[PDB]
């Protein structure tokens, strides 16, 4: 057997464990047989090329399936009334009523209604027909092919890069900051100014005419003249109808602030100046490190020099340069943490400040986008801590990190874990106590005795941004403040109009229910951090297992001795923290969806009165909004929600199936499989057929992973079906 | 839908022929010595 060709130990396994473990360790290149550092880095480079090609192919598929089977040209004409089509349905298991019920969007065939918001994004950036959608899909197919060829080429001999090229920190930082961040942002600003804004103003700009259609009537003469403010004159009127010239301006770079009054999205000229400014700032950032010409900073010198002279950080950041450059898991943990923070930021800032025209009125799309990117954020943060734990097991050299910041983290890990435990117990005890207190006192008919804390700190922050609801009269909500006078000529009118109109999700009003749910969120974040940090810092060893680093990042246990050592590895801490991550994204998305559903209904007082106790969440959010979802099919008929009605139940099934792998453990299943092996060997007309691999029970770690996978898939599919079908049933 | 024959041609192929051939060849690959 030579399927796991990268593992001789796995290939000699006589059982079904060989296939599973070869599948599960296939992309763990550092553990493979005879892996060198150079080969590892080259394989990673080509794999990164392949993932880039996968992303481009997926985006081209979205564009193509829309240009072929969608209703984009119909949706452009009437954006607030036409339901956007994702793709067509051809399922031979449908009956005729299911064919009728999925025939929506103004077309004559069964379709799925898109919730990804690609219509609003593509319409805002200037696409108008199906032809340019198809052309974009072709271009992304070509780009994916180019990146596949590059991945093949940069593995060919005399093109395989050396380890000195891969560990060139300064050159990669300079090029990725100035070019990949800066020039890409500048080019996107160019696309907005040259294409997107004219198509927003009813003027077609394509490859056939963009060299003769000036973005601004004065041309580049104000830019080369230094009279840049000419580009800010004559902005779009508040009577502008998007995609037409009626009420259109001529400005290309403004700082108006707030929203377009019709699209309820940010001004495209504001977005163009934003991406231009971001490009300039990032290109300035990308000239910081020394690559070939004497000028620039050395990263090693910056790290070694920043030791505080009071000695509280010990040796400071000495040795962090080599530790980070030599460890791909340190790099992966930093990258995943920063990405997770920024996709959380994307989720918050995109509902609060939408940039795509008419997407604030697509309630299903807003709910799906927020939920999607927040679940992605939870996954990324768990991955950051997991790969940090892997760095501590595999790549942390203590002798190279003497009295370092990393060494001092390891030296006060007990204080860190104990104070995280204290703050988690503090938050949980009192948050659950307030919720249960409110539940009991409302059940006994006395809601006036509830403990309702006004969130005055965040309300004060809202007033500092200009919200006049709470009467705090500070910073931008004070008409005499220096902060008010400073920004009054540039962005303060549009921002103040957008923040003080209760027609958007810009700094939504908050009460005691908001206070309680943010403190529950604080509990869940601190507890997930406790599990992950305790896993990373005890990954090398504990009092129960002082030689844990000899056993690797993942292993089942250390046996029933010493009291019992179930789930002692750092992988098991990842496994335990996955449930807490699912719990916290569940709480966050529940809060977002219930607040927005009550606001969109014009019934925000229902959230304000029911969110202070748990029975309000169970009854007025879960039970109340489940009714159109669970009636997608019934004994009287079916409608288009039926698929979500199926998927919901599907989720409730597979989640429960996960429980089987997490509660029942191995030896029971191994003895059952032994009885089954006897039965097959002793049954006539079936013992003519023989297995090639011996049937065994799943291993301990594998079963933990499989139960986690079924659990997580059930979690995601259940909530996705609920949120989409509930928002569709109430509003669409 | 333009080229309406393409779903009825490709969906049975992609959903039944592609996984059958992949499962057969992967079975042969993972079980051969």
């Amino acid at each position: 057997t030579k399927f796991p060709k990268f593992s001789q130990a796995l290939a000699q396994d006589p059982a079904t464990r060989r296939i599973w473990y070869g599948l599960a360790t296939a992309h763990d290149l550092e553990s493979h047989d005879g892996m060198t550092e150079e080969n590892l880095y080259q394989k990673i480079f080509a794999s990164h090329f392949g993932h880039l090609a996968v992303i481009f192919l997926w985006t081209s598929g979205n564009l193509f399936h829309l240009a072929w089977q969608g209703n984009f040209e119909q949706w452009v004409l009437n954006p607030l009334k036409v339901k956007p089509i994702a793709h067509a349905i051809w399922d031979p298991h449908f009956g005729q009523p299911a064919v009728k019920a999925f025939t929506k969007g103004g077309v004559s065939y069964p379709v799925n209604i898109a919730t990804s918001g690609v219509y609003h994004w593509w319409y805002t950036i200037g696409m108008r027909s199906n032809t340019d959608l198809y052309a974009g899909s072709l271009f992304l197919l070509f780009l994916a092919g180019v990146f596949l060829f590059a991945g093949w080429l940069h593995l060919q001999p005399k093109f395989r890069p050396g380890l000195s090229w891969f560990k060139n920190n300064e050159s990669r930082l300079n090029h990725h900051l100035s070019g990949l961040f800066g020039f890409s942002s500048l080019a996107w600003s160019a696309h907005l100014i040259h294409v997107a804004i004219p198509e927003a103003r009813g003027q077609h700009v394509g490859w056939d005419n963009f060299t003769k259609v000036a973005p601004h009537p004065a041309g580049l003469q104000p830019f080369f003249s230094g009279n840049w403010g000419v580009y800010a004159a004559a902005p779009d009127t508040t009577n502008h109808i998007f995609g037409t010239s009626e009420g259109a301006g001529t400005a290309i770079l403004t700082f108006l602030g707030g929203f377009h009054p019709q699209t309820q999205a940010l001004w495209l000229t504001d977005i163009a100046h934003h991406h231009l400014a971001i490009g300039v700032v990032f290109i300035f950032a990308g000239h910081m490190y020394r690559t070939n010409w004497g000028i620039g900073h050395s990263l090693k010198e910056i790290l070694d020099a920043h030791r505080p002279p009071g000695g509280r950080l010990g040796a400071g950041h000495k040795g962090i340069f080599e530790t980070l450059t030599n460890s791909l898991h340190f790099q992966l943990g930093l990258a995943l943490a920063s990405l997770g923070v920024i996709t959380s930021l994307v989720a918050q800032h995109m509902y609060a400040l939408p940039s795509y025209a008419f997407i604030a009125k697509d309630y299903v799309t807003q709910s799906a986008l927020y939920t999607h990117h927040q679940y992605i954020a939870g996954f990324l943060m768990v991955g950051a801590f997991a790969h940090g734990a892997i760095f501590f097991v595999r790549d942390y050299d203590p002798e190279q990190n003497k009295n370092n910041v990393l060494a001092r983290i390891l030296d006060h890990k007990e204080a860190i874990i104990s104070h995280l435990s204290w703050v988690s117990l503090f938050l949980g005890f009192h948050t659950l106590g307030i919720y249960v207190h409110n539940d009991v006192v409302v059940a006994f008919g006395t809601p006036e005795k509830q403990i309702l804390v006004e969130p005055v700190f965040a309300q004060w922050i809202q007033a500092s941004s200009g919200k006049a609801l709470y009467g705090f009269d500070v910073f931008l909500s004070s008409s005499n403040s220096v902060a008010t006078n400073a920004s009054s000529n540039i962005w303060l009118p549009g921002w103040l109009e957008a923040i003080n109109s209760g027609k958007n999700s810009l700094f939504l009003p908050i009460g005691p229910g908001d206070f309680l749910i943010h403190h529950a969120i604080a509990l869940a974040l601190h507890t997930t951090t406790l599990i992950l940090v305790k896993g990373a810092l005890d990954a090398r060893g504990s009092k129960l297992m002082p030689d844990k680093k000899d056993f690797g990042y993942s292993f089942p246990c250390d046996g029933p001795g010493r009291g019992g050592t179930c789930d002692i590895s750092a992988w098991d801490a990842f496994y335990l923290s996955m449930f807490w991550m699912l719990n916290t994204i569940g709480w966050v998305t529940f809060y977002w969806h219930w607040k927005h559903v009550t606001i969109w209904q014009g019934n925000a007082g229902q959230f304000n009165e029911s969110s202070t106790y748990i029975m309000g969440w169970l009854r007025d959010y879960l039970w109340l909004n489940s009714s159109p979802l669970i009636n997608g099919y019934n004994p009287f008929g079916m409608n288009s929600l039926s698929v979500w009605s199926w998927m919901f139940l599907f989720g409730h099934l597979i989640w429960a199936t996960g429980f089987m792998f997490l509660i029942s453990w191995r030896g029971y299943w191994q003895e059952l499989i032994e009885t089954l092996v006897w039965a097959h060997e002793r049954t006539p007309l079936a013992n003519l057929v023989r297995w090639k691999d011996k049937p065994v029970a799943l291993s301990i770690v594998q079963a933990r992973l499989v139960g986690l996978i079924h659990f997580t898939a059930g979690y995601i599919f259940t909530y996705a079906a609920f949120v989409i079908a509930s928002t569709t049933g109430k509003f669409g | 839908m333009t080229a309406a024959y393409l779903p009825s041609i490709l969906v049975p192929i992609i959903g039944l022929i592609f996984p059958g051939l992949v499962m057969a060849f992967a079975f042969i690959y993972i079980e051969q010595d």
Partner: peptide, 30 residues
Amino acid sequence: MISDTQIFIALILALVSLVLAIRLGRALYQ
């Protein structure tokens, strides 16, 4: 709207990408 020829052109480009992906997969497999 999109014609049959345009879909065929996209299919040809996808087949080229399939050949390149198979070559990259064989190169990564050593």
